[PDB]
């Protein structure tokens, strides 16, 4: 698949709000992606003993891991499609030394959309959700081509 010039200005005007609090949006994407499905939370040997989400807000280290993934995801989304050098790396290392599922990267993909909405009344319309669903699906085909590569 592949986006349109359109949706890809949609993404990255979108990717820029996000940059002016890019720990927050971290924050509230992790701390979403826990509630909603907890079996992930196991994944983070750094910290998978949170149980609440006063002791998520807590942590700096979800939120130094929360801005990293963000920083990665927006540096691939900003390729608009042109990611094969800098997604291979993440893919790679997803498969092998965090054991990500495909479906946990369906689920922080929801949650991403859930925060941008949370986030931005009146700029996360339908054309922008709609773009940044397809731009974090072509991001998820592209990990999994990586996957199948692996037999993960
Ligand atoms: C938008 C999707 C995601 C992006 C862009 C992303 C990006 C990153 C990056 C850049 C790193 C550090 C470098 C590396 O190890 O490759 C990382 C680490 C990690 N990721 Fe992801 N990630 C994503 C989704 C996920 C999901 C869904 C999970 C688990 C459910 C996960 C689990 C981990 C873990 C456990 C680490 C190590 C964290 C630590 O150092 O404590 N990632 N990720």
Same mark, same amino acid.
Request: net charge positive.
């Given at each position: 698949?592949?986006?349109?010039?359109?949706?890809?200005?949609?993404?990255?005007?979108?990717?820029?709000?996000?940059?002016?609090? /890019?720990?927050?949006?971290?924050?509230?994407?992790? =701390?979403?992606?826990? @509630?909603? !499905?907890? *079996?992930?939370?196991? +994944?983070?040997?750094?910290?998978?003993?949170?149980?609440?989400?006063?002791?998520?807000?807590?942590?700096?280290?979800?939120?130094?891991?929360? /801005?990293?993934?963000?920083?990665?995801?927006?540096? =691939?989304?900003?390729? @608009?499609? !042109?990611? *094969?050098?800098?997604? +291979?790396?993440?893919?790679?290392?997803?498969?092998?030394?965090?054991?990500?599922?495909?479906?946990?990267?369906?689920?922080?993909?929801?949650?991403?959309?859930?925060?941008?909405?949370?986030?931005?009344?009146?700029?996360?319309?339908?054309?922008?959700?709609?773009?940044?669903?397809?731009?974090?699906?072509?991001?998820?085909?592209?990990?999994?081509?990586?996957?199948?590569?692996?037999?993960?």
């Amino acid at each position: 698949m592949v986006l349109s010039e359109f949706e890809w200005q949609l993404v990255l005007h979108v990717w820029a709000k996000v940059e002016a609090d /890019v720990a927050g949006h971290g924050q509230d994407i992790l =701390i979403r992606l826990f @509630k909603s !499905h907890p *079996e992930t939370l196991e +994944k983070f040997d750094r910290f998978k003993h949170l149980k609440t989400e006063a002791e998520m807000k807590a942590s700096e280290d979800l939120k130094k891991v929360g /801005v990293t993934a963000l920083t990665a995801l927006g540096a =691939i989304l900003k390729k @608009k499609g !042109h990611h *094969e050098a800098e997604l +291979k790396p993440l893919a790679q290392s997803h498969a092998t030394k965090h054991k990500i599922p495909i479906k946990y990267l369906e689920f922080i993909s929801e949650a991403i959309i859930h925060v941008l909405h949370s986030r931005h009344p009146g700029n996360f319309g339908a054309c922008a959700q709609g773009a940044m669903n397809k731009a974090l699906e072509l991001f998820r085909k592209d990990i999994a081509a990586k996957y199948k590569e692996l037999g993960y």
